[PDB]
Design a protein around this ligand. Structure first.
Ligand SMILES: CC(C)[C@H]1C(=O)N[C@H](CO)Cc2c[nH]c3cccc(c23)N1C
Ligand SMILES: CC(C)=CCSP(=O)(O)OP(=O)(O)O
Length: 361
């Protein structure tokens, strides 16, 4: 949580973008791309209403032409697009999610668009935005710093989450804003347990980079704190999640080493642990996020290694590859769209892949 050689990376933010797609016309709208990407994800898993849902959800920018790159890349996708598709497998369930972030600028405006969407979600079936509004001032400012401020995701079975940036006013304050948010939400107990497990402080070795929460009421409510791990071994990362309710000793270290090799310029993108908190749960759960592009030279190279890992865990590698194949617009050895995968082992294993549309370069 200090120097520029640590923490999360800019990805496409701050860089100029050109449209470059074999699949989409420049006149296709953001909402149409999203609709297409989501349908193709379900296809890999084995439409007029969906596009209307998504145009609604992304209103107004959803009608903007994809062919005209934003002044400012979004951070939700590594190719700077305002949308990122993910597919998640949990135990015997599998489903599709879409994350989204306003492409509009500048940052205060993009933030405000995000605040506006929260309020348009407030009245939707099963949604509660009260916990979000309780902590929202900790993550917003007139002059927001960092790579993002507010993004959202929808998951269909519609469930919504919000992503918030504790580094909105600098990395040095991230832990404090995170802590205050956890206390306000009544999650002081598991937060303390995590904090004490990590040694009582937060630095680049386990740095609060994002706070997410499911926008729902009741014991179902869930907060995730994402900690980026700059400059530490696979074994050290594994040890950090030993406080977790669902910790499997060595599992994270094995996934990290197995998929991403030993800790070289393109391994600047730090691995991340998502600690998940809920009401009446005294310690968090933990989920591992393994960096894909650009640690790996292409989606094909990443795919081979992730497929081999899934198999050794006895998880469904065929479904993962089918999703990659269905959703990707380029031949995989020349494709660079996988952002992360996430993983948890044990008796209720979880695997997810997060995919840039692959439209901007
Ligand atoms: C802050 C984490 C959630 C985040 C991260 O550390 N870096 C990503 C860019 O390298 C941001 C990101 C965008 N979409 C994502 C989907 C799943 C995890 C992500 C992201 N990170 C691990
Ligand atoms: C889109 C970003 C930044 C993170 C997504 S992590 P996640 O939504 O897959 O976490 P869950 O699957 O809801 O537990």
């Amino acid at each position: 949580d200090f120097t520029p050689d640590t923490g999360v990376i800019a990805e496409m933010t701050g860089r100029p973008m050109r449209f470059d797609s074999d699949r989409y016309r420049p006149t296709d709208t953001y909402a149409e791309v999203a609709c297409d990407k989501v349908c193709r994800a379900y296809e890999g898993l084995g439409r007029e209403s969906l596009l209307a849902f998504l145009r609604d959800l992304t209103d107004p920018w959803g009608e903007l032409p994809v062919g005209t790159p934003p002044e400012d890349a979004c951070w939700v996708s590594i190719d700077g697009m305002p949308l990122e598709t993910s597919v998640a497998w949990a135990g015997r369930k599998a489903g599709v999610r879409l994350s989204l972030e306003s492409p509009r600028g500048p940052a205060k405006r993009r933030m405000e668009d995000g605040m506006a969407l929260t309020r348009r979600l407030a009245g939707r079936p099963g949604v509660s935005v009260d916990p979000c509004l309780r902590v929202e001032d900790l993550f917003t400012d007139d002059d927001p710093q960092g790579y993002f401020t507010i993004a959202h995701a929808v998951a269909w079975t519609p469930r919504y989450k919000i992503f918030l940036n504790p580094a909105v006013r600098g990395r040095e304050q991230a832990a404090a804003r995170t802590e205050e948010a956890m206390i306000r939400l009544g999650l002081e107990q598991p937060w303390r347990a995590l904090t004490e497990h990590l040694g009582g402080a937060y630095g680049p070795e386990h740095e609060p980079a994002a706070l997410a929460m499911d926008l729902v009421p009741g014991d179902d409510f869930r907060v995730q704190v994402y900690l980026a791990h700059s400059g530490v071994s696979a074994e050290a990362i594994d040890a950090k999640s030993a406080v977790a309710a669902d910790h499997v000793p060595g599992s994270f270290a094995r996934a990290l080493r197995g998929i991403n090799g030993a800790d070289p310029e393109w391994k600047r993108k730090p691995p991340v642990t998502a600690f998940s908190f809920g009401p009446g749960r005294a310690v968090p759960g933990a989920t591992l996020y393994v960096p894909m592009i650009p640690v790996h030279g292409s989606d094909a190279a990443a795919r081979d290694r992730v497929a081999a890992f899934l198999r050794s865990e006895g998880m469904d590698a065929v479904g993962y590859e089918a999703v990659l194949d269905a959703i990707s617009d380029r031949s995989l050895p020349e494709s660079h769209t996988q952002n992360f995968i996430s993983y948890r082992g044990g008796d209720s294993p979880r695997f997810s892949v997060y995919l840039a549309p692959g439209v901007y370069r």
